[PDB]
């Protein structure tokens, strides 16, 4: 009746040991939670049947989020999510290989425009063709 | 096939709460039509609506819960509806499973601009009922979405 | 964002009010391991307080630590009234197992020795 | 949440009168007979949310921006302009006039 997710998180180039102190897998936006053991893998307990959205929360690294649909009898699957076109089926394995992507983007670097930035200003051009056409 | 629902109205100098039969309401819930049958004023009850709204005060409408387990009302400014010619529209919100929710009631027009009204205007109800059941809100569109994107894809 | 960090913003870790706490621990370990009211397990630094790991759990009854106990360097806990039993290694700060136990209202949790060492865990509920 | 997708779903109502105001010197609940018109779109959220607040400006001249609260501790700033019903199926000359 009542069933569990397993799964594995590694980061590229990192061990666990940094990572795993502050990361929560997630079943289902919190409504079920669980937290990776030593190593870097994760279990989650009291998973009723039907469709859960699993999402390893980690503010170092982030984790492509990755669905599991568990039925009644016994037998569970995992895919990518798509909330658009939901129907679609794209497998994957089963003992979740979430790798991560590296640290996200949280951070907009600064513009910091040139001056071959400003060569070719729009309206330096809108404002230029009246001044060809002021001289003739 | 069809029920029928008390309608109060009440008026008063003090704009106290004394609610009087007007109307009854026979909502048919088949084909949801609601048509309402009231008795036209009187001259007491004209001179009593005369005085609620050289006061500016409410006019108040209410109807039993279900066909005394209860009330909903409303009101609107009697002066008002005494400057539209007895011109209104009380409208019946239910909800989805078919239970009274409320009774909302409206001149036409609203406001008042000071028009001196005499009596003989007074002796017709032009009232427009209406039923609104509850609207469903639309959800989110995929098929254009994914046709149109396939489109583009290809 | 902008990468101007701390220029204005500023965070405050809180843990609920602690509903169980250890302190017995190695001197240089410095570290104290507390679950409290919120549901939370944290470990606080000895010397300033501050949160080392924290470990956030289901808002509502369903993960509410019912017992603490605290054996050589992990702490073991017992949660949603004995459904679920952990162990969290204090110092990297992460489970050591994870482990779902049967029906029946948790009500005492101890420890149990073979001759000279402890080695299992004994878990009581009504039945 | 919708239960038939499994997928957390936006829903924006708007309010919008006809093309001339009622009134403009001065609004009141008694004096309101139309009623405005509901503009409605849902859009699919794809994660979940634990608390929403409207950015508030004291004279409300910056734009409006909604601090989607995620369970992961983000604070989402979403734009309110991308939540606009009006935005239509099929792109027009109207609609690129307004962008
Ligand atoms: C707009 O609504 C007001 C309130 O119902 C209408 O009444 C005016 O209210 C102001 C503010 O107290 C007074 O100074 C005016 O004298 C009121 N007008 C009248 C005719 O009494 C107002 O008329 C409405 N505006 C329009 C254009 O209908
Ligand atoms: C009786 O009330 C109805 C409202 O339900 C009035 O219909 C309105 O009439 C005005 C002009 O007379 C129009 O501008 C509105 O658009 C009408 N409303 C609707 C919903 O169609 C009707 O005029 C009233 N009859 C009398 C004699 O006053
Ligand atoms: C959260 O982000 C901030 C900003 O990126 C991190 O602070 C940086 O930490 C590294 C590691 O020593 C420093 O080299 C950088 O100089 C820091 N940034 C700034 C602007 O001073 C912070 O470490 C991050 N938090 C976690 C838990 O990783």
Redesign the pocket.
């Known amino acids: 009746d009542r069933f569990k997710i397993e799964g594995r998180a590694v980061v590229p180039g990192v061990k666990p040991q940094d990572w795993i102190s502050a990361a929560r897998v997630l079943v289902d936006g919190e409504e079920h939670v669980g937290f990776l053991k030593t190593d870097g893998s994760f279990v989650v307990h009291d998973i009723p049947s039907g469709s859960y959205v699993v999402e390893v929360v980690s503010p170092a690294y982030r984790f492509d989020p990755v669905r599991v649909d568990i039925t009644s009898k016994g037998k569970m699957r995992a895919r990518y999510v798509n909330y658009i076109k939901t129907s679609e089926v794209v497998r994957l394995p089963y003992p979740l290989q979430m790798k991560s992507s590296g640290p996200p983007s949280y951070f907009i670097k600064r513009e910091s425009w040139g001056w071959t930035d400003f060569l070719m200003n729009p309206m330096v051009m809108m404002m230029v063709l009246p001044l060809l056409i002021f001289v003739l | 096939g069809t029920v029928g629902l008390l309608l109060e109205h009440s008026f008063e100098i003090d704009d106290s709460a004394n609610f009087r039969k007007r109307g009854s309401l026979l909502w048919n819930q088949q084909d949801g039509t609601l048509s309402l049958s009231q008795r036209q004023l009187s001259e007491e009850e004209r001179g009593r609506l005369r005085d609620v709204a050289a006061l500016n005060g409410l006019y108040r409408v209410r109807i039993p819960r279900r066909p005394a387990g209860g009330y909903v009302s409303s009101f609107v400014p009697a002066c008002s509806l005494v400057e539209s010619?007895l011109?209104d529209?009380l409208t019946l919100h239910v909800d989805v499973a078919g239970n009274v929710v409320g009774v909302s009631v409206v001149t036409?027009p609203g406001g008042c601009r000071g028009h001196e009204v005499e009596d003989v205007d007074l002796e017709l109800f032009?009232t427009?009922v209406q039923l609104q059941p509850p609207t469903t809100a639309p959800g989110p569109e995929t098929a254009a979405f994914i046709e149109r994107l396939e489109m583009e894809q290809a | 964002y902008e990468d101007q960090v701390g220029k204005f913003d500023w965070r405050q870790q809180y843990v609920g009010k602690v509903k169980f706490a250890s302190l017995e621990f190695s001197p240089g370990s410095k570290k104290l391991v507390v679950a409290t009211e919120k549901n939370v397990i944290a470990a606080l630094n000895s010397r300033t307080g501050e949160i080392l790991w924290r470990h956030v759990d289901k808002g509502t009854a369903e993960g509410a630590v019912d017992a603490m106990l605290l054996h050589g360097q992990d702490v073991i806990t017992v949660s949603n009234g004995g459904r679920i039993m952990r162990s969290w290694e204090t110092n990297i700060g992460g489970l050591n197992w994870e482990i779902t136990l049967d029906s029946g209202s948790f009500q005492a949790l101890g420890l149990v020795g073979l001759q000279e060492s402890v080695r299992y865990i004994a878990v009581l509920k009504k039945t | 949440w919708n239960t038939k997708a499994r997928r957390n779903e936006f829903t924006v109502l708007e309010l919008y009168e006809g093309t001339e105001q009622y009134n403009a010197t001065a609004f009141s609940s008694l004096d309101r007979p139309q009623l405005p018109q509901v503009l409605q779109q849902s859009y699919i959220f794809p994660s979940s949310i634990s608390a929403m607040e409207a950015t508030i400006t004291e004279r409300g001249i910056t734009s409006r921006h909604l601090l989607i609260g995620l369970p992961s501790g983000a604070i989402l700033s979403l734009p309110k302009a991308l939540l606009d019903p009006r935005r239509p199926e099929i792109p027009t000359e109207q609609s690129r006039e307004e962008n």
């Open positions: 010619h011109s529209q036409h032009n427009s």
